[PDB]
Design a binder for this molecule. Structure first.
Ligand SMILES: OC[C@H]1O[C@@H](O[C@@H]2[C@@H](O)[C@H](O[C@@H]3[C@@H](O)[C@H](O[C@@H]4[C@@H](O)[C@H](O[C@@H]5[C@@H](O)[C@@H](O)O[C@H](CO)[C@H]5O)O[C@H](CO)[C@H]4O)O[C@H](CO)[C@H]3O)O[C@H](CO)[C@H]2O)[C@H](O)[C@@H](O)[C@@H]1O
Ligand SMILES: OC[C@H]1O[C@@H](O)[C@H](O)[C@@H](O)[C@@H]1O
Ligand SMILES: [Zn+2]
Length: 241
């Protein structure tokens, strides 16, 4: 029951949307809920987004707003946190000193690749005697068939096997980023994938939490809700255990 969550930004109705979709948890890519009121029984998870998020005020805000902390967002990408492994490791003791359950930085891709961003982070954390409690991952599928759920699962299993930490899926959907602009599935293809993916993730015992990207169509064409109205994907996510 506890696995299903979502990423969110504020809007009139965001609270009722979080409640109605059945999110057990959420995050906002920031250290606090960014003005959002959590529904009863929905846990806020803070994030230290990037290098310049590592301050006394952000770390205090994070420890006051929740119990679990997510570290930097896609440091492997020039358009996101855009950090070396050395920079992430050098900042790590400040996140560790909060005492909160701590998630690895969330890499865009290649989490299972030897010599990749995550492999070098995990290996330096182990050499320095650091704590990494769990690994959050991002996945966007470019094959829009019933085969997509098996492909996402191969990726989560590859990362779980290499590092032996509980997995969170903090951002996923069907999106093909290989072309000049993003390519999306049909509404019926996206709804079917929501249904098959959540059933797979619910039974996959080393996955602790997952978060569809994202709650609102004002954030992304893969959104579940327009204002407080769910689309067929929103309906399929609400029905997931
Ligand atoms: O120094 C590195 C860069 O720092 C910037 O300054 C920081 C500033 O950006 C940051 O603000 C937060 C936003 O970055 C954050 O943005 C969210 C995205 O990261 C997220 O990205 C997803 C991605 O995770 C993946 O899933 O793929 C998705 C599809 O492509 C992609 O969208 O998307 C969400 C939804 O749109 C974004 O909201 O949002 C936070 C909440 O609003 C912001 O707080 O804050 C830090 C300080 O805390 C700043 O340092 C500079 O501007 C850059 O120039 C630097 O290179
Ligand atoms: O642009 C390329 C895309 O790569 C994906 O795998 C990342 O998660 C996105 O943040 C990014 O937009
Ligand atoms: Zn250093």
């Amino acid at each position: 029951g506890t696995k299903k969550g979502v990423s969110a930004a504020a809007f009139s109705g965001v609270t009722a949307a979080l409640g109605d979709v059945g999110a057990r948890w959420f995050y906002t890519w920031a250290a606090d809920p960014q003005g959002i009121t959590a529904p009863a029984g929905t846990e806020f998870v803070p994030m230290i987004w990037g290098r310049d998020s590592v301050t006394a005020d952000q770390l205090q805000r994070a420890k006051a707003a929740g119990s679990t902390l997510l570290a930097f967002n896609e440091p492997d990408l020039a358009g996101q946190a855009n950090m070396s492994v050395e920079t992430a490791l050098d900042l790590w003791p400040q996140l560790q000193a909060t005492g909160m359950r701590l998630g690895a930085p969330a890499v865009a891709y290649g989490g299972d690749t030897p010599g990749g961003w995550l492999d070098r982070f995990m290996s330096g954390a182990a050499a320095r005697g650091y704590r990494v409690d769990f690994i959050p991952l991002h996945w966007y599928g470019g094959d829009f068939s019933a085969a997509a759920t098996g492909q996402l699962q191969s990726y989560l299993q590859a990362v779980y096997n290499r590092y032996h930490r509980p997995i969170w899926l903090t951002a996923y959907a069907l999106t093909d980023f290989s072309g000049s602009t993003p390519r999306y599935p049909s509404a019926a293809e996206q709804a079917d994938f929501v249904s098959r993916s959540t059933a797979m993730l619910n039974g996959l015992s080393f996955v602790e939490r997952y978060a569809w990207f994202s709650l609102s169509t004002s954030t992304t064409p893969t959104g579940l809700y327009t204002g407080t109205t769910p689309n067929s994907s929103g309906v399929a996510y609400r029905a997931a255990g």
